[PDB]
């Protein structure tokens, strides 16, 4: 629908998507905005309701999927996540460039939908590597972790399935994996500008 063409993030969650669009919005808030989530799971320290994510219970988000408020939705470890029709209209209210992170199955959801984004995968350099990173802040139960595993190795998996990203950016460096975000976005950057 109307505004500029959507960007879609996904990788493993912990390999660097989350971090590079908050980069993004920092240096470029005049041009993009973040789709704030649903999510079902409980917040981190330092996760923020309202920009993070909407931390509601499941209760409140089935109430809400009912009433058709949804995009798309997905199980993931456990909890519900899903994208609000106006967590995405909220930007595009804006004139703003939407920039979303979702996992897979979220990829597969907007694909069928009409929202036509760009499709940027963010990979680890290895599971080992995502492994550690994770293990850092330690916010998972080891039945979460499991399932966690599970999932990343999924989606580095199918990371390289023709058709499916735009980008692959396998994130050793920050600063890297940055710029190679933004080169991907470089077009659409200039336009809006
Ligand atoms: N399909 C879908 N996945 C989401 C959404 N929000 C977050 N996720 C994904 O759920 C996974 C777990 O997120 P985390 O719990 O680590 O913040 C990540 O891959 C994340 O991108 C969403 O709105 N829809
Ligand atoms: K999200």
Same mark, same amino acid.
């Given at each position: 629908?109307?505004?500029?063409?959507?960007?879609?993030?996904?990788?493993? +969650?912990?390999?660097?998507? +989350?971090? /590079?669009?908050?980069?993004?919005?920092?240096?470029?808030?005049?041009?993009?905005?973040? +789709?704030?989530?649903?999510?079902?799971?409980?917040?981190?320290?330092?996760?923020?309701?309202?920009?993070?994510?909407?931390?509601?219970?499941?209760?409140?988000? !089935?109430?809400?999927?009912?009433?058709?408020?949804?995009?798309?939705?997905?199980?993931?470890?456990?909890? =519900?996540?899903?994208?609000?029709?106006?967590?995405?209209?909220?930007? !595009?209210?804006?004139?703003?460039?939407?920039?979303?992170?979702?996992?897979?199955?979220?990829?597969?959801?907007?694909?069928?939908?009409?929202?036509?984004?760009?499709?940027? $995968?963010?990979?680890?350099?290895? =599971?080992?590597? /995502?492994? !550690?990173?994770?293990?850092?802040?330690?916010?998972?139960?080891?039945? $979460? /972790?499991?399932?966690?595993?599970?999932?990343?190795?999924?989606?580095?998996? $199918?990371?390289?399935?023709?058709? =499916?990203?735009?980008?692959?950016?396998?994130?050793?460096?920050?600063?890297?994996?940055?710029?190679?975000?933004?080169?991907? /976005?470089?077009?659409?950057?200039?336009?809006? !500008?």
């Amino acid at each position: 629908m109307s505004g500029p063409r959507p960007v879609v993030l996904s990788g493993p +969650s912990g390999a660097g998507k +989350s971090t /590079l669009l908050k980069r993004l919005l920092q240096e470029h808030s005049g041009i993009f905005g973040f +789709s704030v989530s649903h999510t079902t799971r409980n917040p981190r320290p330092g996760e923020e309701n309202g920009k993070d994510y909407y931390f509601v219970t499941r209760e409140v988000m !089935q109430r809400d999927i009912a009433a058709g408020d949804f995009i798309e939705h997905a199980e993931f470890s456990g909890n =519900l996540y899903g994208t609000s029709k106006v967590a995405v209209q909220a930007v !595009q209210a804006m004139n703003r460039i939407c920039v979303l992170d979702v996992d897979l199955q979220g990829v597969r959801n907007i694909k069928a939908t009409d929202l036509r984004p760009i499709y940027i $995968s963010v990979q680890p350099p290895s =599971l080992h590597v /995502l492994e !550690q990173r994770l293990r850092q802040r330690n916010t998972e139960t080891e039945e $979460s /972790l499991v399932k966690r595993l599970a999932a990343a190795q999924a989606d580095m998996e $199918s990371s390289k399935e023709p058709g =499916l990203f735009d980008v692959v950016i396998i994130n050793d460096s920050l600063d890297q994996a940055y710029a190679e975000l933004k080169e991907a /976005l470089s077009e659409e950057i200039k336009k809006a !500008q």
